[PDB]
Symmetry: D2
Subunit: 502 residues, 4 copies
């Protein structure tokens, strides 16, 4: 007997036990006489079109692949639940938080950002940590990262950032000129680059990392009073990281290290959990916060904004079929039940558009009817009809226009959004030159010890050495602005690497 | 109170009765506060992206349309059952025919050929009569016409024939030059052109027409003995046709006459039925038949091949949602359970390829999981996986390769096809100059009376008058070959029409 | 010799003249030996898969259809040019208007709203009049109607409105209960319903109707000063309408009357033109306008806002292939060159999202590379890459991220949009009960004469008679509010029709 | 200065030189004022829908990914030419071979089989070597492997084989139980498994490997006389292989080793070439060949069937954009000009169906209009029309039906295929138990030396150790049948590995 992942098929055979083999059928349920040989004109003659068994099977095989996710392509999934452990009903009317001990089913997908489908798990990258909550007020998708921040603060740059992080358009190779030209020109990236190149850039599987909502959200209570919040989900298995050397070894030996680790943990009963916290900031505190509190390159310091415990995420179930439950899952940040709303974080606003949009491409217009995406603890009743691969009854003969005088679904006034006044011109405002160094300096100095600063600078120099000198110089300039020692230590290591380079 | 079709919504309201209106939700089940107004910056300001209710709804609306069927676009559907009334188990082992009184659920779609989605029902055209039988040996699709024959005997010409029957590629108009140039050059069309331009070219709705399989099929019994057959399903409501004048009036007043007539009949309990017959021909009779018995331009005369009664089709149920059940239905002639097989009819062989192929385009690779297409009285178990819009469980964790040593589905030797030896070179054989007049002459002379011959010639001349003279001459030449009176009477009427034309 | 439309193929043959027939090829350019017969095992044997000529052709035929447009499905197209005839450079910096005599190529598509692909042209409906201007500042799409107004003033209701105007979801029939329930509940529709049921509801082909932008747009001049405007394009062939009786006759005799009329006019040199006008309103006038000047249910009265002449549209070219140039054309109201901008018309704002969104579905992500959609008088240079059916060079090896230090395209500050301040809360504002009768009354009383009022009431009653009584009563109530005579005359005719109804 | 691949962007900048930066535009060519910041209601307010620059860019980014190839996903491409160096016109009338010195442009894609898009190049796998020849008789696609044989001899098993070679459906991991269960049950795999696990299983980049057509093809000369042939294209850079240890190191250090190696070779002028040979067998020799000569698990021994030189493939051009030219390229084995035909190799027959079928999914129905797929040295003239993303003119107003009397393209009798008679029943014939060991034994004994046999057995045992014991036993049984030493040496190493396993 091996690890549970290696025994997948043996275990499936054993559950079947004395049951006779099912009859092998075509797509349309017609029994198949022989699926080992094709129909031919005698033993050395050509193939006949009336071999429809062959064509049915081959045509399906031809269309097995769907587009990979534009980002976060390489993933591992699991199911379990969220349990409420404290009352936060003062902050939010959301039914997910309604009373202590209320259990909500969840789906999670862990992912890297830049690697395509086949790529190694144990590489330096931000990790996605997406959580779908199947609530009675429909699904809530909290589509998180393993970092509280991101590289950019304006959503128009996200395609550019991803292009720089992927392959050269001509050579189809990873290109450090591209990666570091983009970062050196966008120094709002310094904060997330510092975290990325620290130890937690390569977690030891998905079980040993935190997740964050990263954005500011707005919570609204039953009285219509609003606060801003951050979501944090801190690992109960404890933070653990791979060394660069072990990460490299695993990249070759086990490209799917993350998938295997998580599948095995759940199959052997070692159920990974995370404690779900909020930080809360009031609307008055948001006016007086030294930075933009909706700036995705900034954290809220813990002293001023302590973590308020809410609940626990537990993963206790493996996906039965990976394609059905993990390839096809779709998380939309716009799927927010009443009591949770978008802040004016520019980056979050961009994400409200982008995700349904890509889901309709990658999966299809009716992707929300795919069972993993279905809000199966709500009744969906609306005026949407038709579209390819329309499943169930398409809401039967119900009137398909609103308003109507025929008792078809009605809007629910309690579900109406929180109202705010905003001051200023409707125009494009420049954020680039915000305050991109202050909190990065706090991280370098007050969070990292001396050993960690040394590895941070060795990890940066090891990547940045492959850029052209003019890029290296602009990169080092930005690191210098964070802290003289940060810049100088990077420059020192680059001088060594550029001298060894013939 | 009006006809049942006009009272669709009132009846739906009444069934709901005292029930409170459902809550109006987004696609993801989140309740909607207000779906009458969009979120704006003050009363005369611009629209916000965080209006996701608006974007969810609009984006769905944008993708409501799917490709129309390449042919047979305009359709009406119904459900009911097939009941066996006689034993034909001597001819076929098919479970659909297994014992007297065995009921099988059916789905039917009636259609014209050339009209696009919006077009009028009451036009001169062949009518489709497609029947899906949901058997325990999977679905059987008998994809029939309202005529026993077709215009062509080789499947390579089918796209050409349809192009000639549709719109000019530049003008986007119906083009009689195109229609009649194609027919005048392909005189195998004479038989189906004669039927088309007779009275039964415009049936009085779908209830007053026969359906035919048209092709020769091969029936195989439990001993492995094969016969050839034709399927006929003769209307129990009796044949009835619209006059050209009434057809024209209805085309303007009620473009959806066929849909309305059938929906109303079923809603008022007047359940239309058809008696299902076979003609049988043995393999020896097929050797000695004066024509090719697999020639789709030929009938089997009733004296030599009498109709053997089998069962009854009854339509007793309206579709609940037209898009779900009629737009999305897909019939594949290749879906044949054991005991029914393809003959070597060249046209049928072509159809075994074409239909799954177009279904994967029009609907999607997993179109057989759409509930109307699902073989819900069989267990589907196979090695097909994934593909966009994968529904249910994708067969769970079952081994996905065959052969395997893990008890995954097994081929069933009893379902193996009937074996035949064929003599000759593998090459392209010319059929054009077969015997394209003999059975047409039998129809003109022995089936039609004098009144019917006169209308046939008036109906042809009325269409053919719009072709160029050289086309008219080649058309009349082919009609002359059927019978001198056929050609002469057409020429006479054309001379009148061409003189009135300035 | 017939009309030019009827002689399409003869003319094509004649242009070819002495040229030998091209060689018939597969999709991949391989010459075809015989495309009249399929490869079979002897003359009465089955079809072989190695007949790839057959499968290549059939598979293409299977995928000929694309989704029809969700609205405006049935269309006729033409090409020509726009010529500037007056200086409006004081109002707009747009290069389309740059100097007198400047010619810009155009594409136009005329359409009904509700009819599907096959449907009759000569029916009562609003007509689309879409104009694509191929300018040197890229394409400008002015996607107009044959009416200055529309039925609704908030874009969230557009899917609902279209559903009510199309087929019942169960019966698949047109449903007057649906049509009039929606209008009776949304009395902002009264203005467009009055125009629709007047004489200009059924124009005599596309040449005898006006087009309007309908929305308020914002013009910006080279000094950065903004005005609001309306676009009007008035027919130079003069307004002409079909009677209800002639419309009905043509619906049966010539379903494609509009397509034929326009194709023939252009082929015989009778080039239809429209005079292109603007109305201008200043930002101060917009503050003091008695209604919302961005309300799509309102006109700007001509006395207060006179038509300023700008140029002339001339259509002088037929599409060479209808599918290439008319089915595949895509117009995006968001395609506005510098100097033309969106107003805060809520309906226009909705349209900025919806059209690219549906185009990516109907045509594909790279639909702007389809030659009719290509901005062929601009160089397209951007950071967009890949996507299915990527044509040309995908911008070669150019850096694909922005900002970059490698001389890839740069933003152009002169193209930056006009800035405005807006006052108010970000919330959903109710518009329903605006002023929905005042301008309708002006139309009924001051524009229509007595004969026209009588036909208006006969046309309404003739449609509305088929609704249930409670709907009829709410409809008449809203007409009464416009004018007592309007309501009373409709009620009188309904009493007659409801008495004749058994 | 680095390798040319690393200097891609610097070289692109330098070619541009003094040229001013292009203007950054939308998709529709409208100039962009600012693409660094989004439009917001004041500096901390929400995002507006009228930011169409943002939505245009984001929506495109959302749809960048297309489905990866179902097999051979990970690829490197290049262009160059084929030159004829000897006369083979006695064997084939194909215009590619027409006279000595005739140059034909080519496109090549090298690939692994099982790895997805992101995966490492330097892994043990068969390599694809696909060649598209752009001839004047259209494109010829010779879609080859780096081995003369394959694992299976019947095309119905190809989906099963690929499933076993890819990821477990539940765990999404590579599964040795799956790999070796399939091979141990299908011992026709022994020949290709022996080659795969020898040294040439991991070539040193794409330049140091042979390509083979693998199938028997049929050549037809101008007199209509047919022979059978194999195509071989032997590397002129010489065979060179990576050790298992170096392959593992490169898999981690340079996942894209193959892409980089080939791009650099071509950019530095070191143009890789292959000598193109045929083996010829006459129809009489095919009757007397000891095996099935159309059996894809068999070679033709070189003594009996010597290599006849034909020409040279030279690769001298890098793709300008990888997505345009390598992701979107499509090779169809069915694209054969006159003079080259399919043999009755069952596996080739299957491939005639599968490839166009998958191309229409992965790329689109009009994928042959993508410039890399376009047969640009032939005029394509046919009756195919429409389909999504129809480019060029859709063949203008040419008649779209055949036959016609309007001078539209005509079939070319010289292009008609070679005719053969075949003897036997049309049924499913069992091939499994053919002669699966004889030629494998010849390879083990006569081709491999002692060192190579030892590595072969170490390479097999190193993979097969991870299977369950019952699979290991059935695998070893099949290896024993090839040669007692083959089986015994594998069993010995497995006993060592299974003892170390706790």
């Amino acid at each position: 007997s091996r690890d549970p992942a290696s025994d997948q098929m043996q275990h499936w055979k054993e559950q079947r036990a004395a049951q006779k083999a099912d009859v092998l059928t075509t797509g349309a349920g017609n029994p198949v006489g022989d699926k080992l040989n094709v129909i031919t004109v005698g033993p050395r003659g050509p193939l006949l079109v009336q071999d429809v068994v062959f064509t049915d099977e081959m045509a399906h095989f031809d269309r097995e692949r769907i587009p990979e996710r534009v980002v976060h392509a390489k993933g591992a999934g699991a199911f379990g639940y969220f349990e409420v452990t404290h009352d936060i009903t003062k902050y939010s009317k959301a039914k997910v938080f309604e009373h202590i001990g209320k259990k909500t089913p969840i789906a999670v997908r862990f992912s890297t950002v830049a690697g395509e489908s086949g790529s190694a798990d144990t590489v330096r990258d931000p990790r996605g940590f997406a959580v779908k909550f199947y609530t009675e007020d429909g699904n809530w998708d909290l589509v998180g990262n393993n970092t509280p921040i991101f590289f950019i603060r304006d959503p128009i740059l996200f395609p550019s950032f991803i292009h720089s992080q992927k392959r050269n358009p001509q050579t189809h190779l990873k290109d450090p000129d591209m990666v570091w030209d983009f970062w050196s020109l966008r120094p709002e990236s310094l904060h997330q680059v510092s975290f990325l190149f620290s130890d937690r850039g390569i977690p030891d599987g998905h079980r040993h990392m935190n997740g964050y909502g990263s954005h500011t959200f707005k919570l609204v209570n039953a009285n219509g009073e609003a606060v801003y919040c951050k979501f944090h989900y801190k690992t109960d298995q404890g933070i653990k990281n791979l060394s660069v050397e072990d990460a490299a070894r695993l990249s070759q030996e086990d490209p799917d290290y993350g998938i295997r680790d998580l599948f095995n943990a759940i199959a052997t009963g070692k159920y990974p959990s995370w404690t779900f916290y909020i930080q809360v900031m009031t609307f008055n505190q948001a006016e007086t916060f030294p930075f933009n509190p909706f700036d995705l390159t900034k954290v809220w310091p813990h002293k001023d904004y302590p973590l308020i415990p809410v609940g626990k995420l537990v993963l206790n179930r493996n996906p039965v079929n990976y394609f059905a439950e993990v390839e096809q899952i779709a998380f939309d940040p716009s799927n927010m039940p009443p009591g949770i709303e978008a802040s004016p974080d520019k980056m979050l606003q961009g994400r409200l558009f982008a995700y349904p949009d890509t889901h309709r491409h990658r999966l299809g217009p009716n992707y929300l009817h795919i069972p993993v995406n279905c809000p199966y603890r709500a009744r969906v009743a609306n005026y949407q009809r038709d579209g390819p691969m329309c499943m169930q009854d398409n809401q039967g003969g119900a009137p398909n226009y609103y308003p109507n005088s025929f008792g078809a679904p009605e809007q629910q006034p309690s579900a109406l959004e929180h109202s705010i006044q905003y001051s200023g011109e409707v125009r494009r405002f420049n954020t680039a030159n915000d305050d991109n160094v202050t909190q990065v300096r706090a991280f370098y100095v007050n969070v990292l010890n001396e050993e960690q600063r040394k590895r941070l600078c060795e990890n940066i120099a090891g990547h940045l050495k492959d850029a052209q000198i003019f890029i290296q110089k602009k990169a080092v300039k930005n690191f210098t602005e964070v802290h003289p020692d940060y810049g100088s230590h990077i420059q020192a290591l680059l001088d060594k690497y550029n001298a060894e380079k013939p």
